[PDB]
Ligand binder design. Structure first.
Ligand code: CUA
Ligand code: CUA
Ligand SMILES: [Ca+2]
Ligand SMILES: [Ca+2]
Ligand SMILES: [Ca+2]
Ligand SMILES: [Ca+2]
Ligand SMILES: [Cl-]
Ligand SMILES: [Cl-]
Ligand code: NA
Ligand code: NA
Ligand code: NA
Lengths: 572, 572
């Protein structure tokens, strides 16, 4: 449970940042934050959102200073984590990101078309992560062009992204809406919860139906229809769209009470578990019955093998790989341990006890996550419970309180609280991976894709980034290329005109690990990271005439304070 | 050392974020981050830098997405922390911020005129914090208007800000430059290091002189000259400027080797200690000799009562209140405990031993900070050492590594490492305060200054913020006022035209602690916090015609997912 100085954590944890927009890398079981990976936020330090390279990745037709990331998931090969990529949603500005786990940096951002608010996200497990599966939460008109605002004619879609290219593969129109999603251990099926079968905005409307549903997607049938050309398109997007509304070959709508929320696949591949939320239950769907259901051989509700009452406000379920499930009860403010097989007996009227233990948590739990739960190798060691209120649990810090991520030992029969982890607004889910499932680089190589655009521009200017310190004049544009070797930039002054569009490229020629440099231009609103063997750039408009200093903002050497230069801006 | 679940930390720590731009609130000795206070960064979650209230506080004539904050200090009454305000510098875009410690929010940002790169910052101690003292690091022409770029005619200034108004009080022109600063325990004196007596840009130039100096400011004389009207002004600023160059009544330039860096006041009020950096020394200046020096009764170097050799790269010194000092050695990667009285005897020629202990730290230490060191109540319990490299100390996370903030027990004769704390780029200094020295509010009062502007606009529109759900049209502006009680906004639909300038005001009517609401407009790049009894607002341009959902992004209730609404944008 404890990590001494000089000792390493046993697992990485990748935490969502919620509306703060980043991913946080923790060591488990120390629960210490090792790194922040900027995604949808703008990072003053590394310049994510400021650098040209990050801006290229972000794309889009407007700058967004925010995002809302909930659901981080790591790429799999044959149902085991492979450590290549992390993917996460953006509910705020309707995007999905991919993070490269070799350098812990975002490398792709995709805008999802003709939907709003990407919420649920999880990955194909088997045969490997070929698809990223994405829910859009909020129904909108199709197309959304202002000619018809009616809810009556508003819909959402389920989206599959090609994991390797990050281009959207296809979308499925559904009835109702989409909340959370998971995938099976064959590649054939994915499934999502719906809380708004009513397609309402008002609170009473969203709660009218006694049951909403889990919608199950026959990914095999969908992919085949898309391959055959049996699809349509919406609006300005060329993405293939198939229609899963009503009675469709692509979907099954299994009724589940009530405004259900989490959707979690058991690590033995047997079950999708929908969390009942307004219903004090979960609903256990037998994946091995879905083939029969897609042939209309059984009823929709025949796939339900258990629907146990657990307590008030079930939100999310996770697994120890020993046959138990752990479910957050938001209103009762507990985590409930229960046995799946015993709940199945109870549903059948063989009235065994199925609840093993309720542990109070502090306070109001959202997601929970057991170590390796999303893989075949679910190890039953650690359980993280991510609670949304902290009240009195930490020192007072004003009206805005931290969240509380609690680490619980589930290695034995009895859940035991070990650590209370204050966290800034606002983690949703997290994912734990063994140390040995991640392989990182300690320095860049000069062909790295993270500065492909810099190499391409340098070639146009005949600049050798590893060697040159040059000022290139291009009309109202100026490109400044500098090398850096601690504690010196290879250029200590340059001159431009007021209003010039200045781009500064810095290449870090240091080879020693951890010798990162920075670059900041005083009063010009720019900063960037340049780690060993990286190139990075920033663009800014030169301000009113005068001297402006630049300096290294990454303490790098005893002579760091002296690592700088001057930009001289002349009257045009 | 250890804080169990349900127990509280004994100290607050306020960490600088460096070029990440925020202040981080830690519990000590657990070393867990309790809260982030946005300052110069743009926070996707709370909307700091997006909300109208934060934008008014930031002011300026352009948006900055970045800052570089090093030096957090808390307001004092008679040399004891009083818990009212924290102040911090911005090196990147030449600002100073004040944080209100009742709500843990920035409330004032001041742009410092006619200087670049605010670095050193510390507070008046006695009789209380009336002044904030600020160093500007980089010499610039006066005025900085592009007519003369020469270093020969470039200078910097020391700045005093009125702590209560946050308006600049006066500035002092100096020779050389300014790095770090501290104040005495009378109010009369402040002092700064200089590393660039050469006023050079090139590295060899900045290290040419064997000695630079500590510049001591006679604050009493300066304030008198200003009150008498004996000052000038620079450029377009009305701030009073006095000239402390050369032989001046306002300054004394005590030679100190070599490119000295930290400047630290001992808690008995006896010494200013300059950290030698390129010289393996510190220089101990006796404050009780300064009156004699300002009457020319002693020589400049007669104020030096010790100049002990400690080791390679001394950067920052801190104090246990027992007569020992603790100095970071950046090159040797150690913290050195030494006895001040013995160093004075050694300087006098006595055959004595002033070094007590060298502890290896991991790796390359910058600032260090002992609990209550900046006050009379320096308690000698804890020492934080903030190191700039972490190498192998934490799990690998790519080319960019965390920093390492180490917690050391200094309560006894032997310094003992207790904890290694990974931190994101890049803390400089921190300040520790007892739990009982901070008094926070849990909910807002409706007269709070943090939404005075919202109140004034509501009044003009005839709106009662605590009761109204109204849409106000004013040309092409739309002001939308809503109340909120989780899980329902008081308005679930509103209509605007494409291109309208839409301002949404939300007033949180929940009264229970920790029931924070949020607000996000999908695809419009806005988010904001609304904590209990707060009002907050965001402004955005309505996009292309269509439906856009808004939702609460602060998990607030079991029905959080249903806390939404729609903005309907029509073609103009
Ligand atoms: Cu490069 Cu500090
Ligand atoms: Cu309001 Cu969640
Ligand atoms: Ca419903
Ligand atoms: Ca919360
Ligand atoms: Ca010098
Ligand atoms: Ca570092
Ligand atoms: Cl889920
Ligand atoms: Cl200092
Ligand atoms: Na099959
Ligand atoms: Na089958
Ligand atoms: Na099969």
């Amino acid at each position: 449970a404890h990590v001494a100085p000089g000792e390493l954590d046993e697992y990485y944890g990748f935490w969502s940042g919620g509306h703060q927009g980043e991913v946080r890398v923790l060591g488990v079981p120390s629960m210490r934050e090792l790194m922040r990976i900027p995604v949808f936020n703008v990072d003053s330090a590394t310049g994510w959102g400021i650098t040209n390279e990050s801006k290229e990745i972000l794309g889009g037709d407007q700058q967004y200073l925010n995002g809302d990331c909930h659901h981080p998931h790591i790429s799999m090969t044959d149902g085991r984590y492979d450590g290549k990529y992390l993917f996460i949603n953006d509910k705020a500005n309707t995007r999905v990101a991919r993070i490269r786990l070799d350098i812990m940096k975002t490398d792709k951002i995709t805008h999802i078309p003709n939907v709003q608010a990407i919420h649920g996200l999880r990955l194909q497990k088997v045969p490997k992560t070929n698809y990223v599966f994405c829910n859009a939460e909020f129904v909108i008109p199709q197309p959304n062009d202002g000619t018809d605002f009616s809810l009556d004619n508003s819909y959402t879609m389920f989206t599959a992204i090609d994991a390797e290219t990050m281009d959207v593969a296809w979308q499925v129109i559904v009835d109702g809406n989409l909340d959370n999603t998971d995938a099976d251990y064959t590649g054939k099926y994915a499934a999502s919860t719906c809380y708004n079968s009513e397609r309402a905005v008002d609170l009473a409307g969203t709660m009218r139906n006694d049951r909403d549903w889990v919608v199950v997607f026959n990914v095999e049938r969908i992919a085949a229809a898309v391959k055959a050309g049996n699809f349509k398109t919406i609006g300005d997007s060329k993405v293939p769209v198939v229609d899963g509304r009503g009675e469709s070959e692509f979907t099954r709508y299994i009724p589940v009470p009530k405004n259900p929320h989490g959707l979690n696949t058991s690590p033995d591949g047997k079950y999708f578990i929908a969390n009942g939320k307004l219903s004090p239950t979960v609903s256990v769907i037998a994946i091995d019955k879905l083939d029969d259901l897609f042939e209309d051989k059984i009823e929709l509700r025949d796939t339900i093998v258990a629907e146990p009452e657990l307590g008030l406000g079930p939100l999310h379920t996770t697994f120890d790989g020993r046959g138990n499930a752990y479910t957050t009860l938001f209103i009762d403010s507990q985590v409930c341990k229960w046995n799946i097989a015993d709940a199945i007996k109870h549903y059948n009227g063989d009235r065994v006890n199925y609840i093993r233990q309720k542990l109070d948590v502090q306070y109001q739990p959202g997601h929970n996550h057991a170590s390796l739960t999303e893989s075949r190798d679910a190890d039953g060691k650690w359980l993280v419970v991510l609670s949304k209120f902290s009240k009195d649990r930490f020192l007072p810090v004003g009206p805005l309180h931290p969240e509380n991520d609690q680490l619980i030992d589930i290695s034995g029969e009895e859940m035991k609280l070990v650590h209370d982890g204050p966290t800034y607004a606002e983690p949703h889910d997290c994912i734990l991976v063994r140390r040995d499932q991640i392989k990182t680089k300690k320095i860049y190589e000069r062909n790295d894709p993270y500065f492909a655009s810099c190499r391409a521009q340098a070639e146009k200017d005949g600049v050798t980034l590893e060697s040159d310190n040059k000022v290139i004049r291009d009309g109202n544009k100026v490109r400044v290329y500098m090398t850096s070797v601690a504690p010196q930039y290879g250029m200590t002054e340059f001159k431009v005109k007021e209003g010039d569009e200045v781009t500064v490229y810095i290449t870090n020629l240091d080879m020693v690990e951890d010798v990162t440099h920075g670059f900041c231009m005083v009063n010009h609103g720019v900063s960037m990271e340049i780690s060993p063997q990286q190139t990075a750039s920033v663009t800014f408009t030169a301000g009113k005439p005068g001297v402006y200093w630049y300096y290294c903002n990454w303490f790098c050497h005893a002579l760091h304070m002296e690592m700088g230069g001057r930009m001289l801006v002349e009257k045009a």
